Design a protein around this ligand. Structure first.
Ligand SMILES: O=C(NCCC(c1ccccc1)c1ccccc1)n1cccc1
Ligand SMILES: O=C(NCCC(c1ccccc1)c1ccccc1)n1cccc1
Lengths: 546, 546
């Protein structure tokens, strides 16, 4: 029966409430009890604050009106306002102190996941202070988790006027008995309750959440920690840069601040960074998640030599030039991580900082070709199978759903063996035709990769493996160099191909290298342990790349 | 006969040269003459500096090798190096002091315009210092003006080795007698001269430019000030954001730093900001030049109500939300400027700063509809002609080349009269069928707009004029507000429609408003006076929006 939940911003989704700060200011300044809250409410529906909440005036126009209300109130109370009394300082500090009430937001996110329509109905103002960006950032973080955001100053109505509740019900397309309304002010609950809405008076979050649990029949308190916020591809800004006549690179962009370039591995997409993109934008970074050459909406020329590391690195530099970026932080995973180490060795002036997930920096051996080094490790046998053009493309393109279901699995769910792939005649020869869905991915996420690989296939992606000799001769030019810019190596405990021990001698080449290690994490690092990846990257970016 | 010009970076395109700074350090530190230049060249082809210029080692690896060369040199000279002697401090200060030699760059730009292939051939290093961004920014600014950039550390060869000159001729596809080579080091001229190239020894820029004038037969010195750098659409990063199910906005993006949103007028394009986009990116801003709703690659829904200011402003806020931008500086011209004032009145928390070119802030009059106010000015008669759907679309779409040739003219070239458009039965009824090309625009620039308007026509653009009543009723909600965020009004002397005197009472509503005025500037401000617009915007952005 209940299908919508409406939350107030102040005192419910954001703590502390402004009224709580007015009460603390009177206690700190030895002012009469309720003096500031009386000045705030002065005039009722015809007062300065109602005009402010309705959007008739801005916050800066209201500030001297509130100051005058404070003096009028103090004159009747027979008291004197302190020497340096300022409404602006009081409100700036109050607005700045207000943070998201994470448990209340987790409950709203959980109700929305269970089919509820969620809305914020708040009495707010048009903020024109020099510090208005702090409020704008809070509103941006919150509004993405709600279906509707109704602000009094935009609709010209305020709570507790009965018209804003009628407006709310029309916006939600729901009848009052289908709506739960949460508010910290009892006067704002009264009109919702007259219409027949379920109301919860928020004094403390825990008791408010227990009432919300009891009335919705959904567990909100004591539930497990949720996964990070993910990307909806159709909600992303899509960018397209032509780096050379036939090569165009596609990227997805989110955030402002230092540029951070995300480089995916094989056989992946910009979508492989879906849990990182919102967290990294929220941390204060401009994230550019690439579709590498040969993938998704990026150009996929058929020629092998178009995917040698030298051409690939030169095109990433041109990509920076065309976007007008002198530097970017380069974060790679798998083949992307292989590329970001060579970006640091050949173009250090364009790389602000370098991070690799799973992929170690392995210097080229001038005494041995990479094809003879590949044969010396039985786990790299699938790389010899990928050499002959057409062979692996036929197997990997035959059934796209099966390809991504067999590959994208947690370490304990792996249904493939990378050794003796050549003798068996394929990657999937002793694997099920219909593999089960991994606990790591959903069916909708698997179909995104299927749709992406339906466009250009596996030729471009497989050509990254077909330049062993060209990459080796080019890497041999950097054997006298060291990586002396900020660098991070993240190892994944359960990656059986890119094993953590493959990274142990990296300090000889990158002496001030920072490390990260993720336990119980397989190859697909970003989607296997998203919270752990986000915390390791955000901490290193904040300290070494800012 | 001469068809290529090659310039060195150090001492030719960038001043001062590193060798000049080594000589000044010896004079300042009372060290023997030539001591630092001997340490620099120590070992010749087998020394640390040749290894650095060839890309064998990075700048940070070379620094302690140069320090050791300095001590070895001082021991034979029987002298002591000062207490705080540091190669890093000396090189950081030398690299940082180096600026673009504007006259030398203007000459290269002029030779390229006259059909010459231009190249930079430099002995440079892989810079991995914490301060390497300064060098990266210099290289980015320069490389866009040259056909080729050959760096010794990338090709493994150095000047004066004869192989780098053979490599240069193969890259240019030219024979030595067709090439002019400019260098400040005489030893680097010798091999170019042996091949038969024309060489110029650059001691001072003026004498070097007189030699270049005499040999090319092209005037380089004393020529007029050139127009700002323009945009090549195919070299731009193209962004696409879906703001609502059927509405997608297209933008072009360049730069890093605070976000700056450019909003064009009628009947224009993101391309109207072609002279501003590179200058603003170079000034340290992330420029987003929009194709407004109804134009170019942005969605053009047929419905009139899709272009009312309220819908338009809400979609620009959603545009910011989807890109993850809490704020942007909004700079508008014409209809774009009309929109940026309403972005400041309704969403001040999302607007970092607001600037309008030509368009004044005119508050809504609640006692008079905007249609009766339009009739009271004979110059706004074309707005009544634009009211009836289909009529103006038929005239403006009939001949696209004629439409843009008749509109895009300087104040003295205007071939149209905006008064009595209704009585005459059209904008072009007493105008030539083939108007001459204005001195402001080229034929290629006119064809860009023709190609853009061939897609969705004039319906969407004309619908901005068909919401007079809806815009008026919505603007009447902001009559009690003031604009209290940083604001700039730029007036154009010769705009006969959006006359400068229309802006005189703006201070009553925007009390701390900053002003700009451009003399001998008509309606098409950005392309009429691009250098003047760029300087007014960059100065205001640097002081009020940073
Ligand atoms: O082969 C490389 N990555 C693909 C590994 C992947 C894979 C192997 C074989 C086929 C497809 C995908 C994998 C999947 C699961 C577990 C470990 C590894 N690298 C080569 C140098 C840098 C990357
Ligand atoms: O009509 C508006 N701008 C178009 C002016 C333009 C023009 C007028 C008529 C047709 C096309 C283009 C013009 C061209 C040349 C000189 C002055 C003005 N505004 C309405 C409010 C804000 C903008």
């Amino acid at each position: 029966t209940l299908r919508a939940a409406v939350f107030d911003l102040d005192g419910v989704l954001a703590l502390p409430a402004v009224f709580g700060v007015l009460g603390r200011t009177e206690e700190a300044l030895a002012l009469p009890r309720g003096l500031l809250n009386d000045a705030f409410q002065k005039g009722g529906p015809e007062g300065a604050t109602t005009r402010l909440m309705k959007g008739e005036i801005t916050l800066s126009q209201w500030i001297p009106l509130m100051e005058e209300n404070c003096r009028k109130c103090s004159e009747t109370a027979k008291v004197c306002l302190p020497k340096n009394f300022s409404i602006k300082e009081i409100f700036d500090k109050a607005i700045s102190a207000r943070k998201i009430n994470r448990p209340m937001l987790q409950a709203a996110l959980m109700l929305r996941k269970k089919g509820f329509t969620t809305a914020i109905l708040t009495n707010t103002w048009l903020d024109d202070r020099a510090e208005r960006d702090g409020l704008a950032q809070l509103m941006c973080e919150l509004k993405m988790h709600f279906d509707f955001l109704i602000e009094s100053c935009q609709v010209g109505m305020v709570k507790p006027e009965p018209q804003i509740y009628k407006f709310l019900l029309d916006t939600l397309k729901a009848s009052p008995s289908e709506v739960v309304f949460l508010d910290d002010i009892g006067a704002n609950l009264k009109p919702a309750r007259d219409l027949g809405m379920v109301t919860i008076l928020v004094q403390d979050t825990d008791t408010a959440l227990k009432e919300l649990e009891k009335v919705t029949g959904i567990q909100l308190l004591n539930t497990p920690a949720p996964l990070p916020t993910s990307c909806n591809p159709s909600d992303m800004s899509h960018g397209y840069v032509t780096v050379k006549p036939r090569v165009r690179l596609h990227f997805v962009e989110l955030g402002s601040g230092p540029a951070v370039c995300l480089c995916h591995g094989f056989p992946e997409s910009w979508y492989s960074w879906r849990y990182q993109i919102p967290a990294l934008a929220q941390a204060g970074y401009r994230v550019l998640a690439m579709d590498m050459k040969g993938y998704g909406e990026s150009s996929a020329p058929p020629e092998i030599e178009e995917y040698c590391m030298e051409v690939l690195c030169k095109e990433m530099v041109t990509f920076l030039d065309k976007l007008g970026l002198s530097q970017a932080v380069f974060i790679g995973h798998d083949w992307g991580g292989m590329l970001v180490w060579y970006m640091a060795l050949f173009y250090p002036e364009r790389v602000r900082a370098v991070a690799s997930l799973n992929t170690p920096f392995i210097p080229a051996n001038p005494n041995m070709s990479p094809l003879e080094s590949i044969k010396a490790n039985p786990v790299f046998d699938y790389q010899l199978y990928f050499q002959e053009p057409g062979v692996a493309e036929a197997e990997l393109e035959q059934n796209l759903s099966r390809t991504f279901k067999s590959l994208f699995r947690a370490s304990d769910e792996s249904v493939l063996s990378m050794h003796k792939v050549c003798e068996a005649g394929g990657l999937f020869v002793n694997s099920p035709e219909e593999p089960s869905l991994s606990r790591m991915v959903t069916e909708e996420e698997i179909q995104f990769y299927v749709q992406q690989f339906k466009k250009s296939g596996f030729r471009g992606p497989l050509n990254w493996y077909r330049n062993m000799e060209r990459n080796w001769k080019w890497a041999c030019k950097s054997l006298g160099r060291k990586i002396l810019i900020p660098a991070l190596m993240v190892t994944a405990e359960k990656d059986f191909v890119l094993v953590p021990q493959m990274s142990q001698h990296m300090e000889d080449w990158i002496p001030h290298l920072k490390r990260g290690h993720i336990e119980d994490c397989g190859h697909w690092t970003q989607m296997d342990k998203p919270t752990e990846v986000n915390q390791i990257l955000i901490k290193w970016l904040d300290s070494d790349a800012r």
